[PDB]
Each structure stands twice: as structure tokens, then as C-alpha cells.
Amino acid sequence: FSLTTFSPSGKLVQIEYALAAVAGGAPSVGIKAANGVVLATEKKQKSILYDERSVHKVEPITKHIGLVYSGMGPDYRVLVHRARKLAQQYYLVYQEPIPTAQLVQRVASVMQEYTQSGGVRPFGVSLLICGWNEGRPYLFQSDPSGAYFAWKATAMGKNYVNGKTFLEKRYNEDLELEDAIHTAILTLKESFEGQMTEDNIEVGICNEAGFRRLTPTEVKDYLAAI
Amino acid sequence: FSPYVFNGGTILAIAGEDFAIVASDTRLSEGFSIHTRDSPKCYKLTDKTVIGCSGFHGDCLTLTKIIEARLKMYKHSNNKAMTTGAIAAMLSTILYSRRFFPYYVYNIIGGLDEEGKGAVYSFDPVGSYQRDSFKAGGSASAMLQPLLDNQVGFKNMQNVEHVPLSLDRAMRLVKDVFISAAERDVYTGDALRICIVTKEGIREETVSLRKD
Amino acid sequence: NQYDNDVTVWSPQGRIHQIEYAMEAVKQGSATVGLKSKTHAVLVALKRAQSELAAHQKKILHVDNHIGISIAGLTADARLLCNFMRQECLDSRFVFDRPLPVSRLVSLIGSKTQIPTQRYGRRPYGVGLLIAGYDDMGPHIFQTCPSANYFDCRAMSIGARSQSARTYLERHMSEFMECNLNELVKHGLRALRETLPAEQDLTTKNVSIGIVGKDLEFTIYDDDDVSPFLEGLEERP
Amino acid sequence: DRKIEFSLPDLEGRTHIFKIHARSMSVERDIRFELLARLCPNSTGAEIRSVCTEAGMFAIRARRKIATEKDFLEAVNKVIKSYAKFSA
Amino acid sequence: DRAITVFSPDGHLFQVEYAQEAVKKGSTAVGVRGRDIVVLGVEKKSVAKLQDERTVRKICALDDNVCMAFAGLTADARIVINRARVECQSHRLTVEDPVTVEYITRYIASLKQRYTQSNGRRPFGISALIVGFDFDGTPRLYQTDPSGTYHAWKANAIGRGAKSVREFLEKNYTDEAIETDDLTIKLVIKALLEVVQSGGKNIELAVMRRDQSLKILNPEEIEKYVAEIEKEKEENE
Amino acid sequence: YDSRTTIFSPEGRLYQVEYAMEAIGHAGTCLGILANDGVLLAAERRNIHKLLDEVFFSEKIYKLNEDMACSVAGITSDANVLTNELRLIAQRYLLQYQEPIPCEQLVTALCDIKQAYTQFGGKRPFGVSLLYIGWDKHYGFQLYQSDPSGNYGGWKATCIGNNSAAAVSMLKQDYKEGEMTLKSALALAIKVLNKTMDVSKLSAEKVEIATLTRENGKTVIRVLKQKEVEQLIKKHEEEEAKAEREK
Amino acid sequence: DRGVNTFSPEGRLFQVEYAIEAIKLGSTAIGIQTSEGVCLAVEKRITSPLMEPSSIEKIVEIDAHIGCAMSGLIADAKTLIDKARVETQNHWFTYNETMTVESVTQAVSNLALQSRPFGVALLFGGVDEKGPQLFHMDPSGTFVQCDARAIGSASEGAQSSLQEVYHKSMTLKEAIKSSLIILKQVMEEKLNATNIELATVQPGQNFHMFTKEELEEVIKDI
Amino acid sequence: TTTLAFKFRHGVIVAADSRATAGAYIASQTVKKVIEINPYLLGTMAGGAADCSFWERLLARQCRIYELRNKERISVAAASKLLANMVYQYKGMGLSMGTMICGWDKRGPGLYYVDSEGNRISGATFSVGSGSVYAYGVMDRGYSYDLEVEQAYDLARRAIYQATYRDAYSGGAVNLYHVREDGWIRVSSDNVADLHEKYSG
Amino acid sequence: GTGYDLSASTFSPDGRVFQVEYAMKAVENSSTAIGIRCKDGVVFGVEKLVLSKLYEEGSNKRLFNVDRHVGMAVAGLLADARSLADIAREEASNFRSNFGYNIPLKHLADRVAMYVHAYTLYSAVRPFGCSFMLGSYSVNDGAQLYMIDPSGVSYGYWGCAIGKARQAAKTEIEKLQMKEMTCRDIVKEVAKIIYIVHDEVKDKAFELELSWVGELTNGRHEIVPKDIREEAEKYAKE
Helix, strand or coil: CCCCCCCCCCCCHHHHHHHHHHCCCCCCEEEECCCEEEEEEECCCCCCCCCCCCCCCCEECCCCCEEECCCCHHHHHHHHHHHHHHHHHHHHHCCCCCCCHHHHHHHHHCCCCCCCCCCCCCCCCCEEEEECCCCCCEEEEECCCCCCCCECEECCCCCHHHHHHHHHHCCCCCCCCCCCHHHHHHHHHHCCCCCCCCCCEEEEEEECCEEEECCHHHHHHHHCCC | CCCCCCCCCEEEEEECCCCEEEEECCCEEECCEEEECCCCCEEEEECCEEEEEEECHHHHHHHHHHHHHHHHHHHHHHCCCCCHHHHHHHHHHHHHHCCCCCCCEEEEEEEECCCCCEEEEEECCCCCEEEECEEEEECCHHHHHHHHHHHHCCCCCCCCCCCCCCHHHHHHHHHHHHHHHHHHCCCCCCCEEEEEEECCEEEEEEECCCCC | CCCCCCCCCCCCCCCCHHHHHHHHHHHCCCCEEEEECCCEEEEEEECCCCCCCECCCCCCEECCCCEEECEEECCHHHHHHHHHHHHHHHHHHHHHCCCCCHHHHHHHHHHHHHHHHCCCCCCCCCEEEEEEEEECCEEEEEEECCCCCCEEECEEEECCCHHHHHHHHHHHHHHCCCCCHHHHHHHHHHHHHCCCCCCCCCCCCCEEEEEEECCCCCEEECHHHHHHHHCCCCCCC | CCCCCCCCCCHHHHHHHHHHHHHCCCECCCCCHHHHHHHCCCCCCHHHHHHHHHHHHHHHHCCCCCECCCCHHHHHHHHHHHHHHHCC | CCCCCCCECCECCHHHHHHHHHHHCCCCEEEECCCCCEEEECCCCCCCCCECHHHHCCEEECCCCCEEECCECHHHHHHHHHHHHHHHHHHHHCCCCCCCHHHHHHHHHHHHHHHHCCCCECCCCECEEEEEECCCCCEEEEEECCCCCEEEECECCECCCHHHHHHHHHHCCCCCCCCCHHHHHHHHCCCCCCCCCCCCCCCCEEEECCCCCEEECCHHHHHHHHHHHHHHHCCCC | CCCCCCCCCCCCCCHHHHHHHHHHHCCCCEEEEEECCEEEEEEECCCCCCCECCCCCCCCEEEEECCEEEEECCCHHHHHHHHHHHHHHHHHHHHHHCCCCCHHHHHHHHHHHHHHHHHECCCCCCCCCEEEEEEECCCEEEEEEECCCCCCEEECEEECCCCHHHHHHHHHHCCCCCCCCHHHHHHHHHHHHHHHCCCCCCCCCCEEEEEEEEECCEEEEEEECHHHHHHHHHHHHHHHHHHHHCC | CCCCCCCCCCCCCCCCHHHHCCCCCCCCEEEEECCCCEEEEEECCCCCCCECCCCCCCEEEEECCEEEEEEECHHHHHHHHHHHHHHHHHHHHHHCCCCCHHHHHHHHHHHHCCCCCCCEEEEEEEEECCEEEEEEEECCCEEEEECEEEECCCHHHHHHHHHHHCCCCCCHHHHHHHHHHHHHHHCCCCCCCCCEEEEEEECCECCCECCCCCCHHHHCCC | CEEEEEEECCEEEEEEECCEEECCEEEECCCCCEEEEECCEEEECCECHHHHHHHHHHHHHHHHHHHHHHCCCCCHHHHHHHHHHHHHCCCCCCCCEEEEEEEEECCEEEEEEEECCCCEEECCEEEEECCHHHHHHHHHHHCCCCCCHHHHHHHHHHHHHHHHHHCCCCCCEEEEEEEECCEEEEEEEEEHHHHHHHHHC | CCCCCCCCCCCCCCCCCHHHHHHHHHHHHCCCEEEEEECCEEEEEEEEECCCCCECCCCCCCEEECCCCEEEEEEECHHHHHHHHHHHHHHHHHHHHHHCCCCCHHHHHHHHHHHHHHHHHCCCCCCCCEEEEEEEEECCCEEEEEEECCCCCCEECCEEEECCCHHHHHHHHHHCCCCCCCHHHHHHHHHHHHHHCCCCCCCCCEEEECEEEEHHHCEEEEECCHHHHHHHHHHHHC
16 A cells, blocks of 8 residues: 555456666666675756756765666656665664675665555656675675575666676676676666767776776776777 | 642532532632632533632633533533533532543532532542532632531530521521631632522622731 | 545636535535624524434534534534534634634635645535624624635525525515514524425424524524514415 | 325225125124234235235144134234234 | 445445454364353464464463453454453553453443444454353353454354354254263263364364363373273264 | 455455465475485576576575575565565564574464465465475474465474475485485485486586484585585486496 | 445435344334333344353343433444443443433434444333333434334334323333233234343332243233 | 542542642642542542642543443543553653542452652552641551551541541542442541640540 | 546646645636735735625625734635634734744745645545735835645735736725825725726625735734725725
């Protein structure tokens, strides 16, 4: 009624429609490398009237937690604001653990107000979470209704099927260094229609030192020689 | 700051064979100054019930108006007036409903019951009541009560016939006790309002007393 | 018709349909008339009887010494309105020791009944009220419909077949200010008698009278009290 | 024009319907059929014919073709079937 | 049409009716009085080799002098026992005298009526029945319909096959056959035994001997009583 | 015909609840077998996509208390909140009584909350059914199965998965009380899981099993890691080969 | 339509026209208010002999000077009777006197519709300063004073018979016999003491059960 | 104020004084300090007279409601426990009340002393008020479980007389009640002056 | 239509709120009104149908006094109109209590329009079926006049009309030359316009409720003296 609802016999029809909605069209690939995690997405703004440094697709929830998302961006803003508040509350309760990767699983778990209390209309955004304050990296996905999946490499766009196929065929692998961002950009290239540029592609990286949204300078540098 | 102040006043009721006499002073004062020489403590509530309120004047006024409102509500809800015993019980419920911050007032209800006999119900500031043939309330209670029970009740008197009180005799004793109490108790005097309750209705007489 | 289902919804043609249905609640009720004079206000209500064994029910409800009302229609949410008006009048007595003027009380009733006409899940108070009161400006007669749109009236009647009573009052309303108490009560009795079919006639047991005046507080007269007024009926059924 | 109606049998209507129906069968009016007319308030004319049909059915069930003096049996079957019609 | 907790055009309360028909899905439940002992049985026939028979809990105690049995939905029944047990402990806290069977049955009926009221709460599709010795010696049996009501019965006969077992009980409910505790128990048997096969160990009987605790009959003694019933059946050619 | 959750049927059935409980059979697969000196749970890992990392260390098996552990078989959205509430109830009892909560009391509390969810208000029933294994001072090792209807049951060998009928039939055929031990329970669980999973030679990754054992005055809930699971698989394979060839 | 609050298109909201026709499923009950007192007669209509007759009660004493007879859903009548008892006791506690039966009926009518409306009709009867009185309260929060009222499945026939068998100057002795003969005419079985309950109202007596199986002295005359 | 109440084989005897005072001044000497709860229960005033009266009336309506609901008379222990629980929620708010609820029930005569502070205990005999300390001694010396009804009457009258004589806040009239199996009965209302005249000898 | 004009929370396929589009129809159906800003004040005027002579002198008047200097001339569903007038009175009283002095007409109109928009925004509550003019005068701010539709927003009006015949009144209003005519002749002219609007052509006899505010009344919005404005009614008749 006022929660996540509309579940007939053996089905979650409303949830299934939410999952059809989050199919979206923004790939937003994520790769969990040995050194860290790379979350790369596509910012294909309509015309040149819009700006790319004004709004962002990758949001640092806390010191080393970065976030990328899928369709229904306005829902994603509220979701990331809630995630920031929840992480801040956890850090205030358990004071000074520098909680990122011992929190990445926890913050993903506390993404239950995200969907288990849907709010009449469930959220229509699936989000990938990265954290590396445990000596090891973490990549998690929360969907409009489920919970943490603990991915190693995935995509959540219009061509997420072929994007995931490209990720597995290109062998996301385990020995890959932090510079698997090249493979992430290549995976975006498959689900991209145009000459991708520094402002057209937004990517954030989360290594053991922390999380950082790569500026257009480094994005263009990586896009060079591709 | 304190929400209570003693405003004086003396009330008195007597239950006769067929009459109810409710007399009270009208001098309103506190500390050492007198507000007015005309402030009746008697209040008629029905054609057969008159109450007396003495003590904190503001609480007296509030309690009287709450009693009026409750009587009107009961009359609407039952298509009839309220019996003297019933209003006594209702006043008792009201007084204890505010037990932890009580009305610093003394209430004496004088009127006629269903049988047509004089009924006087004295009250405590926190709700206690009992049916009595007569009672006096207020500052002059200590100096007025003994006269009326040793005369009306013939206490400590032998070889005397317990003649029922006539209306005129009861009125004369009321006037005597009030004029005696006015000079001793400074809160008492400047007037006296006497309400006679019978089948014919309520008759009020205002007599003048010591002006000091 | 979809648009007639709920009070909140609005009909495409204009006014909503639930309130229009609410006015049929007062239409489906025993007739009652109420008229003003120079100094008195009189209500004549038809005490509708279920059967000869049972009583003729209760109409002309009592509110205060100077205000009395007559209900017509849905009796369930009518004692509620009577309680509300009694409470407001007693609040006025308690706050400034004066009889609540009838116009302000009627405005309060209209405001109170307006909210259910807009709040979902709340039915309108389908009760017709004929309020008789004596404020400082002489007697007053007010009609309150379930549409929460009250009216002031020299003489108004509500109930089943009340249109005939309305016409009689309108034709005789010119000679209403200059009438004695008995004369005005007889005017009201003739108005109410014209409502029922010719078979029915005014009886002491099936009629109620509510009179409020300058020196006369509101009083509900019935059979023994009605008989002096019922005399000289001039019966033309 | 002239829209008219009835279908509201009172005591006098019900007992007259009893009489005309009792004209058929082998019954006679020595039965206190007025008691059963009072028992069923506004039982139409169809049910009265039904009740009379039941009375004949009870007579043949008892295998007695007599119904003129079979009044107690007449009353018994009519009242029990009135019970069944109201609640079965 | 409409199947919610509102009055239907013909009356009734169809959701309440559906709840009352839901007891049919469940199990039989019989129990009798006798002024010496109250005994009630259920006769469950469903036990797989992998489920523990301890936690079936078809009969449960309330205050070591009151016990109730299931007929209908098990989860609703268990919630009813929990709430009723809490209320018995409350009525033991206040009013220091132990709970009476009529009082707890009244509380259960009141809870069921409360849940039938309003649309939010499902009307507790369970039909309970309560036996037990009161404080003043007399043992009593009450049976509570799911809707709102309780009735003091000599025999309960609630559940699947309720009509046939109740007819059998009312056919030969002989007080001379009640008399002794053993006679009472053997009267409950051969009556509950009549329902379904009842062959090996299907009977699940319960015993409350005056002031003793709730006695659950041992299977070997149950087979002994079945053999005694067979012996009584014999020599009757 | 279905409507708002708090309804009945013309016959008198809770068809929404029945539909949810039947849907529990669809998707997910867990089974619990109780034996002396140890009671274990076996879970079927549904999705074995190579792109996961298996860092949560447990998906079906959940540790809910020091002396108990559960395994859900319904929708994960309700499963997570139900596990959180169950842990909260157990720890609240531990705080109140300063004693581990008996398994039956915990299961009754959880089924009470589920019965409340399916009883009042316009709220969906919790579409999840979960097993519980645990140890207590009164009854020792216990196993319980609770359905979304809120009607739990005290079992000793049961399955709650997709082919739950086939799994419980295989259990009933090859279950022997008393003689059963922890190792024999492991063998039976692996055998029935191989039966209910069509692909023979099940990998250690697609099967997650946890065993609860009673050490010296202390309950140890060990989830069997990959190497131990595949060693059990190898022993089972040897047994199957010997049995098949000896004919 | 179907909404419990929405008015009908013609004149009067539905789902309360449905609640009022719940005495039809209820059992018959008849009360007579005479100058001697008030006679309250009902049928128990026991379905099986095993059920104790004392358990099935349709007449419950609200107080020592008020008796009530229910007709409809006994579950809702329990709540209404409990509220009546609470209101009567509260009034007595507040005013130290016996609450008038009219006031009790008014309070119960106020509580009748304030939740799906109650579907029971009550026949209150008791003594007051205005002689013995009887009131018929109906599920639609409406009460009417009556002298001889009938309610239940066959309220029409019983009321029609009572309309012509009642006279304004009767006593209790005639009232009980009239009510019992009417009851026997309405019901299916006979008026056995185990099936018929009777309640008497007296100015100088509390309202007790009618002699408890020694009331055959009144049914033998029938 | 001074009340006493004791039980024996032939019932329960309740004796109370009829004086209510406000400090030095005596408010009245004809107050019915014994409250007739119902035809089988009685209460007494001690401490705050208004509190005692109001709470005993509330207990009276509560037990009447209980009797009407369950169609059976209330037991003395149940009423005492109910009143004690009712008054316990106001503990520490300053109200004072001492009452000896007594009557006859299914188990026999009962007598429980309920106090505002919280005391609620049974017992053969009790006494509360300013003069209770004087009443206890003369009651104990003259009380036995096998006392005759007239002997119990004389014991209670003499005990209240001595309590009034030795206490400055007690006097006037002595109200004597006898609770029996068929309900309480009012025995006598003897003025203390007449009692002194009789006891002069 | 069909499933989209059922609740105000349901947007139309084209992007419209049909509940308010139907609430405007009630205002269009009810009697008309007119308010003209004279040179030094604002003059109101409303005709009211005496549906039956049983009614007393003009009651349930379409004119209301929401504040000392502010008046409201309303048309449409009159009960909700009176409720909204009470809301406006409460708003003016609250503003006077908080910020002192007298509530500016623009701010009062904006606040009441926001309240009306709040009522038409949700689903459980329904849009108000009334449209009204708020007129006031002060020495500091001159004379202002704001008109609020059942769902729209306040707009500054030199002269406005609402109700049954809006266009017919507005034509002659624009014909009239305001901004230089004193409020006396404006009273005469508003009476003239109302009688130009049809009164008894297809309805009953109409009464003329006219209101005043301006420096000639030093603010203090009051009903014009009807005894001395009966001659203005006579001039309007001619």
C-alpha cells in the first residue's frame, strides 16, 4: 500500500516494471580490479546547451565510497543523499573507524530504506557502490528491489547484456591492475554512439588510497590512445 | 507568585421543615482593603437550589459558572432539572476532579429535595460532602457555627422541647448570628443577602450591617 | 454515473452531485415550518409517528433558553449538530455571559458543515435545520441545508411536500409582523396542515410547537400545551 | 392512462382468497382458515394457492382423500409450510 | 459483489460468514462436562516421519485450570492463545482470585468481535472452545464462534465433521453414562472415534481432573480405553 | 480472485497467503536435516555467474544468534528485514533474560510477526519461508520450518526449495533416526542435493552447507568451506561408484 | 452505492439501510409497557439441547432499574449493553441517583453511530419518575418511545397483532399472557420454559428472571 | 477520626467515629464516616476524607460494573486489590487515604486494609485513624474469634469510646455496622455522651 | 475525461487538471459580480438572486468583510465561499497579530491564492468552487483589487467581473473610463452595469449589494449606505 507492494501470485509486477524502467540507457559500467574499483558512465547530454561540470553522474558518498547509477536520476539524487546521511550517521555512531569498506557492505545493507520501504512508488534506479578501506576493494550493486550482489564487473544500461558479455569475454579477470579503467572505457565504447570525449564520459576510481572522481583532464588522457 | 489569596466572605445555610435559608455576606476584600460592599456569595441555580461560595472569589465565580453550564447540559440531556442531591454529587465530582490543584472555596448547597424537605449539603474544598440540617462556611465559620447548632440543635440544653424551626424564627436567628459575626470578623459585614427557598420560589432580602 | 459517486469529485456540468443528493435527505423527512414575527419566533413541526403504539418521535430540539432548532431528515447526524450548537452556546455563556447571537451560531454551523463537503471519506450532514432564536435584533429564523449554505428567512418550511407550506407562507407573509402570539401560531398550524394530504389532520399528539420571544424563553409545547393554540383551527384540510 | 396496482392482500383479502381457493379441492370452510390468514402477513394470492396446494398434498400423503373435515391436518400442514417458506 | 466488513444488501456480514465457514478446514474437537472432570479431544491424523509431534499443540492451557483447543487456522489460534494467556495472567494480577472460564471466554469473544469490527483487521478465522474447572468447583465448557460470540455447551463438536459428531453426542448424551471419570472419557471416545478412521493413534485426548494440572492422555492408555470401548461394543449382538 | 491482503474467499480460504506460500516453492532451495551431536543445513546456490566474488561469505545461510542459524527461501527484500528482525528479537531476549533464547520461542516470535503481517492492515504478507537449526538447554538440537502463513513446524528432515517434494521424498526414503550421525547427515544431505539438482557431480561452489555442532559447553556453527565440501563430494562420488559397480 | 458514507442518488445513504435490516436475521422480541410495569418477552431459539439454555440470553439487566432486550447480532449487542452499563454507572456515580431510561437510550443511540454501524435493535424497559417506560432503539442510531413494541424476523406480524391485542389500561398479568400467546403464534415450536425468556419491570422491585422454570404458571394458562 | 473493624465466626463488626475536623476547629460531628459501598461491602474514612469518599465511590461503581458484567457478586479480596491497584498509580502525589474494606464472599468473611501509601493486607482485625493506637489495645484485650454478636457490639462500642476519650480529634457519635453472610446491616449510632453516661456506672 | 477527471491529483493526457476545469464551471454558472477600482478607492457590486420571497432582507450576502480595510466579493458555491472568507479573516488576523499594522492587499491575495492552490493540489480534498475579488484602499498604497479564480492566482485588476456573465460585464467595464472617476459615480456605474446585465429576463428579481473602500471612507471597507444608494439604483434603472 504505502510500502513496496503489488506482488501477485509468484510475481512482483511493480518491481518488474521498475526493473524495466531502470534498463534506462546509461551503461554505467563497473569493474572491480585488484588495486581498486572503477565506476565509469556515459554523460550524453542532449545538444550542447546542457553543461557537464554542472551535474554529475558519479557522487562520492564519503571519503572512499563512490556511487554510479542508472535511469531515473531524480530518484538517484534522493537515494545518494540518503546514502550520504546513513554513512555519516554510521560514522558518527561508531566514531572514527574511517569506515569505507568495512562500511561498504554495511552501507549496502542499510540500502533497505532504499527499496524495502519503497514509498508507494519504488525507486527506479540501480546503483553501483565502490569502497576500498579494508585492504581489498569492493563492488556492490543495489537494484530497485533487491539488495547487495557483490559484483566484480557489470553494466546497467540499455545494452547491459552485451556490456556484461564484453566484460566477461574481455576477461575482467583477477590479476588486472588498477588501470582496468581502459577496459571499462572499452566496455562503454560498445554501448556508446559517438566520439566519446572528456565531458561525454564521467568516471570515478576508488583505490586503497581513497575515492576520486576523475577530472576531464585525466578522462581525456585515458581516452587518448584508445 | 502564588495562585491563591483569601478573599473572605461568610456563607450559611439552614434546612427547615419546608424551607431552605441560604444567607451570605456581600463584602469582598483581601489583605486590608475592601473591594466592594455589594458582592453576593449566594447564587441561585434552579428554582429550588441556591449555593453559597466563600473563599477565593475567582474560583467561586468559575465554579458557579461551571455549575451553571453543567446544569444546563444535564437539563438538555435529560429533559428535566437537577435534584439538589444530584447537584451536590456533581459539585463533589467537580471539586475532586481538580484535586491536585483545588478550588480554594467552601460550598454549601441549600434547597429542597424531591420530598419537599429542606436539604443542606456542606462541602470541603477538595470534594468531601455530607447532608446536614445546617452548616456555615467561610472566615466566620468558627464564630458563627456554635450559635446555630446550640440553638437549632438544642445542644447542651435540657428540659426544652425540640420544636421545629419556623421560617421567621430561623430568619431571626440568621440575622442575629450574622450581626454578631460581622463585628468580630472584619471580613463579615456591610450587608447580608438572605435567600429563602420554598415551593413558591426564591425570595431574597438584603439587610444592612456594620459599615466598618 | 461515475461523477456522482463521491463528494470530493466534481461533475463536468458544474456543481457536484453528492451534495445535491444530500439535499434530498431533508426532502425525505417530516415537514416543519418556522416563521418570524415582530417579537416572537415560532416553529411548527410534524411529529411523524412510526405506528399508533409507538410515540410520534421527537422534533423541535432544545438548544438554549433563547435558541431552539427543528430537524428534518437524517436524524443520525442531527443530534450531533444539536450537541455542537449546545456546546457553542454554552461556551459563549461561559466566556462572556451573554446569549450567543443566532447569526454567529449559524455561521459557525455552516463553517463546521462545510469541511465534510470537501474532506474525502466524510459525508455531508444531510440535515435541515430550522433554527429559531431571539437575539437583540428581535426573533430570527434560519434554514440550514446540508449544502452548508444557510439562509435567513421571514418564514421557511422544510420537509416532505413542504412546497405547499412554502407557498402558503409566502402568500400570508405580508401579515406576519403584526400578529399576536396565538395568531402567528395558528398561521403556522394552517401552513403545516396544508402540507399533509386531506386524510391527515392536525392532532395534539402529532404536532410540536417551539416558541421563543422577548420575555418568553424558548419552550417546546406539545399536546396539552398545544391544545390552546390548536383551538380555532379553521380546518380546511 | 389509469395506472393501478394492488398485490397487497390484507386479512380480508387473504381470507377471501382462501375461500375461493377452498372452493376447489375437497375442502370445506369449517376450518378456521382465518387463523392461518392472520399467520401469514401479506402472503399474496399465489402463496395462498400454494398453501392450498400443500394442504392437498398433505392429504394425499396421509392417503386420505377427505379434506372437508380434515381441518386440523389442514391447519398443521399450512402452518409448518409457512414455517418452511419463512425459513427452511 | 462485495466481500468486505460492511453490511450486505440482504443483511449478514459476508466476511464474517466466510470466516465462520473457514473452521471446516481444520480438525474435529469434542469435549464434555460431568461435574467430576472435563475431557476434550482433537484426533489429528497427519504426522510425517520427519516432523516432531511435540509442537502440534492442538490443545493448550491458560491458567492450569483452563484449556482451549484448535478448530481452524493455526496461526490465528496461536495468536489468540498468546493474547488470552496474557489476559488471564493480567486477571490473575488484578482481581487476585483465579480466572473463571466464562471470563476468559468472554475476553476471547470480545477480541474476536473487535477484530471483526473495522475493515483493517481480518476477522480471526478461528473457532475456539474452552473447558475447565472454575474456582467454585463447577467445571464448564464454552465454545466461541469466530465472529463475536461464546456459548456454554455440554458438548462442543467443532471442526470437520462437526454436524455428525454433534448429532451423535446429542443423541446419547446420557448423564448416567457420564457419572465416573472413566465413563466420561469413554463417552468422549467412540464419539470422536466415530470421526474418520481413528484406527491406530489418531485420537489426541486431553484431561483436566478437578484441581489437577492439564493431563494429556498417554498413547498406551488411549489404546487401553479404545480396547475397553471395543469390549463394550462386544457382547451386543 | 484476489484483492487487498486482508480478505477471505467465498469458500473461506486465504488465497493470497496460499499463493504466496506456493510461490515460496518457486525459486530458492534449502534443506535441513537433524542428527545427533550435530544438525546441518544445505542450500542450493541459484546464480553461479562467474562475475561474482562471493565476499558476503553467505547468501542463503544466515547466522542469527550464538546458538542458532537460519536459511531463507523467499524474496530477498523481505528475507533481509526478516533476518534483521529475528536477530533483534534473539538479542532482545538475551538482554532481558541474560540467557540464549530457546529456538522454539524465537520461531514462535517470528511466526507471530508474520501472522500479524498477514492479519491486520493493508500490508503484504512476508513472502519468505525459512528454516532454523539450533541448540538449547531444554531440547538440545532442534530444527524448525516456518512458512509465510505464520504456521511453523518442528521438523527433523525437511526441504523448502523448488523440488521440495522430491527432496523430502528422498529424505524419507533414506532417513534413519537414532543411527544418524553428523557424517551420515552430511552424506545424506549431499545425496539429496545431488538428486534435487539435475546436473550430476555438483560443484562445491553451487552448494553451500553449514553444520551446527556442540563443543565442550559451547555451540559452534561452522559453514563448510569449499575444500571440505568438495572432499565430501569426493567421498560421495566414491560411494556412488562402488555401489554402481558392485552390482 | 457501496460506500458506507456516500448518500444514495434518491434520498438516503445506503449500507445503513442494510444495517437496519439486520433484525430480520435476528430473533423475535416483544415488550409491553403498562401502568403496572414493563413486560419483556423473547425467544431463546436453542439449536441443540446440549447448549445450556442459561448461556443463550437475549435479555440482560443494564442496571437494577433498566432492562434491555436484544434482537440481532449478539456480538454487537454485547458491546452496546456494556456501554449502556458504563454510562448508567457513570451517571449514578456523578449525580448519586438513578439514570433515566430515556437518557440511557439517548446515550446508547449516540454511541450507535459514531466503524461499520451496529446492526442490533434494543428494547429498553425500566421504571423512572415518569412511570414505567419502554424505548425501541434501532441500528440506525434512532430511538423512539413505545408502549408495546415488537422486533425481530417477524416484527411485522407480531407488531400487527400487538396493535390490536394491546389496550392502554392493561396490567402485567394480561400483558405477559398476550406477549406469550403472540410469541407462540410467531415461533415454530412451542413456548417451553427452556426456550422462552421473560423479564418483568416493577416500580418497587428490581428486574429479575421470570421465576426460572417455575414460570410455567404463566405458560400453562397459555 | 477513628475506625476499627474485626472479623469472627458470626460475621464482621465495623465501628467508626463520626467526627471530621479541620485542624483545631471541628468541621462536623455527624458525618457518615462509614461508606456503604454496596449491599455487601463497607468502607471507612481515614486521613483525607474527600479522597476516601471519592475513591470508595469509584470502587463502588467499578464493582457494580464487574457484578453486572459477570452476573456474580464481587469478592472482598478482589475489590481490595482493585482499589489498591487503582490508588497505587497516584502514589507520591500527596493524597492520603486509609480504608478497611470488609465484607462477606464465597470464601467467608474478609477484611483488607488498603492505604494510600500502598498497604493492602488481610487480617483478623484492623483499626485506622488518629485514635487507632488507642483502639488496638482495648480491641485486642476484648476480642476473640468465638465472640457473641452482642459481645462484639459492646467491644466495638467501648473501644471507640476509649479511642474518642483518649484522642483530641475524635468524638461525637459512634456508628456500628455488622457485616453478615446475607449482607451488611446498620446496627446503631450511639452518641459518645450517652456512652459515657452508660459507662459511668 | 473518463478516468482522468476523477481526482485533482490525476493529470490529463494533455497536461491539465480537469477537476479545477469543472470547478470553474460552478463559478461560471453562479451569479455574476463586478468590482471597479475608482480613482481614490475600490467599489464592489454583486446581484443576488432572491430565490424565494420567504427570505428576509439580503442575507447570505456575496459581500464579506475579511479585514478592517479589506472586503471580499465572492461568487460560486456560497458555502465554500464563506469558509474561504473565514480563512481570509483568520489570515488577516494572524498577519496583524504577527507583523502589526494592516495586511497589504497583494500579500493577503497571494496567501489566500496559495491556500486555494494547496486545496486544489492534493487528491483527498477538492478544489474550492468559488471565485472572489479582494478590494482594499490605503493612503500609502492607494487602491488595489485582486481577483482569485477557483484554482488560479490573484491578478491586479483595474476592473473585474466574475460569475454567470463575465464577458458581458467586462465589455461595459472596459467601456467605462476608470482611473479618473470618483467612487460615487463608480457606485452609480457599477449599479448601472449590473442592471445592464440581465436580472429578470430569465431569473427572479435581484438585489444590489454594493461595497465601499477608499479615502472617502478613510479605508474601513464597509457596505455602502443602502438608503442613500437606492437613488443610485434608481439612476441605474434609468
